[PDB]
């Protein structure tokens, strides 16, 4: 089949050099013009660039946002497309895709999560949400990076559990606020995997 499998995501500080590789197996790599479409977390897709086919010249067209910063290449005998991401800034935290068409995006690959944050690996600051008088929840403010997983009654309660998608502060940290809704005295265990800091939270009004 055509499979554009990608590789090369990770965590860097603004101003680094990161490589994005697009392994194309299933089609003649030299006929298509691979392109790289960026999708910042939770917004619409923005097209980064694309290299023309070697037979179409190989001229690489980039965006206005990343001209002079990113450069895109391709190789047939090794059959890989490259997004060379230089001088990254905070905007490059995103899921970069590799489609097989300049004007006709096709396979799209899988989704390489690249993150450019200035933060360091710290566990959660688990802050509970006391009920007004109702629902019971708990914050996970100031953790980095995502993964994160929050259960209630340690994975016993699954009905009513809403693990709000995480949120980025200006400081580069993450904040999940997981909340259950049930009338009552409940526990929330957050496990920040990169640092392995499992904190537990007992909540009352």
């Amino acid at each position: 089949e055509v499979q554009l499998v990608q590789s090369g995501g990770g965590l860097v500080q603004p101003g680094r050099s990161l490589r994005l590789s697009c392994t194309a197996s299933g089609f003649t790599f030299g006929d298509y013009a691979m392109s790289w479409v960026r999708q910042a977390p939770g917004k619409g897709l923005e097209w980064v660039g694309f290299i023309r086919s070697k037979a179409y010249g190989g001229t690489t067209e980039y965006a206005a946002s990343v001209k002079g910063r990113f450069t895109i290449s391709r190789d047939d005998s090794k059959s890989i497309a490259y997004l060379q991401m230089n001088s990254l800034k905070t905007e490059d935290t995103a899921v970069y895709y590799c489609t097989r068409g300049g004007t006709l995006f096709d396979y799209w690959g899988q989704g390489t999560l690249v993150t450019v944050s200035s933060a360091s690996t710290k566990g959660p600051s688990v802050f509970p949400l006391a009920p007004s008088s109702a629902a019971l929840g708990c914050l996970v403010k100031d953790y980095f990076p995502e993964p994160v997983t929050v259960s209630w009654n340690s994975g016993a309660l699954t009905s009513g559990v809403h693990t709000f998608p995480a949120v980025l502060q200006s400081s580069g940290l993450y904040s999940l606020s997981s909340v259950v809704t049930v009338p009552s005295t409940y526990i929330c265990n957050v496990n920040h995997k990169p640092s392995n800091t499992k904190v537990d939270k007992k909540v009352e009004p």
């Binding site: 259960s151 009654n153 340690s154 994975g155 016993a156 699954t158 265990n189 496990n191 392995n196 499992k198």
Partner: protein, 241 residues
């Protein structure tokens, strides 16, 4: 949990030890005395004992005058007793600091309770319950049989408990299977394959599509099922005129 538990517990030796006998619970629970108690009934004819020294050594000797499997546990230590309960920090909570209780999933089986419990109590409290209370393992094996469980695979390097799982069924009407674990002296894949065989034999569902993936084998024509044929013919009924 196990590393820190064993680490600290390495100091109590010299005061108390452990033993494992397959005597019926009646006589030993009658003759126990001088800081001696049953750590774990593992069957109607099997009881692990946790008692002090110089009486627990003569408890397997109160089992050599009766001539039973005599094993003075060389891993002897303090558990299910008070000599380990005093440590309400290292042997009670330091072993297990992080824990993620699981939900229903596939029913597990806790013993200190004697019944199936959700795996939500599995933490340093449970290791506190393996050092404070008994194990009542036999009660949980009866509950396994009640919830439809009969083939028992001994995760070890020698059968000591499946041996005792067969005294579960030496007096129980639900005679249960207890696949013989790698023998004392067995430590190779030839003996593991011999176990996988008797596991299939006893009734253990083996995913044979996992044993044969690294082998790179092929399937070759084998004889089909030998149907043992009766003589079933219903003849048109009647006799002419």
């Amino acid at each position: 949990v196990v590393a820190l538990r064993s680490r600290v517990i390495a100091t109590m030796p010299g005061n108390k030890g452990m033993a494992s006998i397959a005597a019926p619970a009646g006589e030993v629970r009658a003759r126990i005395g001088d800081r001696v108690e049953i750590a774990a009934v593992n069957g109607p004819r099997s009881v692990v004992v946790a008692g002090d020294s110089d009486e627990l050594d003569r408890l397997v000797a109160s089992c050599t005058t009766e001539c039973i499997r005599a094993k003075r546990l060389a891993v002897d230590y303090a558990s299910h007793s008070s000599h380990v309960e005093t440590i309400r920090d290292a042997l009670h909570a330091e072993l297990g600091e992080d824990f993620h209780p699981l939900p229903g999933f596939v029913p597990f089986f806790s013993t200190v309770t004697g019944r199936w419990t959700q795996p939500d109590e599995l933490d340093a409290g449970y290791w506190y319950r393996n050092l404070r209370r008994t194990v009542r393992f036999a009660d949980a094996v009866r509950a396994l049989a009640e919830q439809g469980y009969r083939t028992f695979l001994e995760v070890s390097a020698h059968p000591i408990l499946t041996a005792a799982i067969e005294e579960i069924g030496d007096g129980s009407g639900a005679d249960l299977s207890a696949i013989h674990s790698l023998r004392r002296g067995d430590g190779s894949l030839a003996d593991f394959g011999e176990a996988l065989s008797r596991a299939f034999a006893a009734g253990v569902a083996v995913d044979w599509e996992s044993v044969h993936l690294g082998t790179g084998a092929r399937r070759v024509p084998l004889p089909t099922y030998p149907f043992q044929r009766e003589r079933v013919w219903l003849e048109p009924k009647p006799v002419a005129r």
